[PDB]
Amino acid sequence: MYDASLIPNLQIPQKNIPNNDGMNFVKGLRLGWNLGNTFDAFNGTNITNELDYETSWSGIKTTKQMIDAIKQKGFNTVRIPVSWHPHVSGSDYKISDVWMNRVQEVVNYCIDNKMYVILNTHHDVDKVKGYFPSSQYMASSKKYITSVWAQIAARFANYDEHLIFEGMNEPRLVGHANEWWPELTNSDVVDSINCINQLNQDFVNTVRATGGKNASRYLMCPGYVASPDGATNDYFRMPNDISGNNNKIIVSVHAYCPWNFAGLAMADGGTNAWNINDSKDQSEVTWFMDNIYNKYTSRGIPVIIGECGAVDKNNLKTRVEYMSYYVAQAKARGILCILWDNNNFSGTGELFGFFDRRSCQFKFPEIIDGMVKYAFGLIN
């Protein structure tokens, strides 16, 4: 049965945030949800045609009713991860119209619900088929980013500010020892960071060049592996935007912190405990948020935590407390949170399933109600 008593009573002091267009835009997004393991799937056991990629990992085709349910809960933003590499051909990386049409269909489900949508490139870090953030691969990487974004920009040219473009997901050195963390002492990672700065710049230039609504829409840019440190380190450089635009670039960060609790499986040495009353455990959540506040939000530059969440370890209460605290602390610093939901309830793999797409209802409602309770308020 639903147990509302699990949700903690929190009164976190609001920090000072500038009253500008950028920060107000983010407040309007309110709280987001990821259409995880869907259009981002890039392989599978039984894919007969290209459209099967949508159900390959998710196991079910997206419908309008699903999106209606998400909105009804209180979410006002849907992030739609898309891996374009298995749907591109030729030296010009032409995107299949069949794939593009389907993506636009799902985007429309959200837009018709007056929601905000974030469209990105996801699992496209591939030396041969996509981009790879290292100097040896800059030629192909630039061609990939510019070709793909010119096409996406042209297709969605008529959509207003409700549609946001996220150039890259978690650009990193796949296979490298420092694939999952920007070790600033490593020569290879510094080269990668510089390459990422260049690719973010190319992404912005390409989109802006198409003019119209593309010239003024908000764009998101991540640092190395979209980590908080990748965005706060001294090597990170915000892209130069066209003259006339002011504060239209949003910093993207992903933070499943602390990892041993939020994502590491029990079988792999993870833990299922996190104490909201323990200062050390509290710090595991706020440390990166303070860095983000000091470097960006306190100064009026928007930041979005595009991915967050905690895997199911048969620890409902602890997860309700953790997610509630996480969202409340982010809100106090003007930061938006977007839940990662992969529809996985199989008891195996990464259990980031929350919304049961089969029955169109949330399986751990207390967690999501706690998040809605502490997210940005709605003025009318």
Swiss-Prot record:
GO CC annotation terms, alphabetical: cell surface; extracellular region
- Additional note from the record: The C-terminus (AA 411-475) may play a role in organizing the cellulosome complex.
Q: Could you tell me what this protein does?
A: The biological conversion of cellulose to glucose generally requires three types of hydrolytic enzymes: (1) Endoglucanases which cut internal beta-1,4-glucosidic bonds; (2) Exocellobiohydrolases that cut the disaccharide cellobiose from the non-reducing end of the cellulose polymer chain; (3) Beta-1,4-glucosidases which hydrolyze the cellobiose and other short cello-oligosaccharides to glucose.
Per the similarity annotation, which family is this?
A: Belongs to the glycosyl hydrolase 5 (cellulase A) family.
The EC class name is hydrolase
Sorted keywords for this record are: Carbohydrate metabolism, Cellulose degradation, Glycosidase, Hydrolase, Polysaccharide degradation, Signal
This protein is called Endoglucanase A
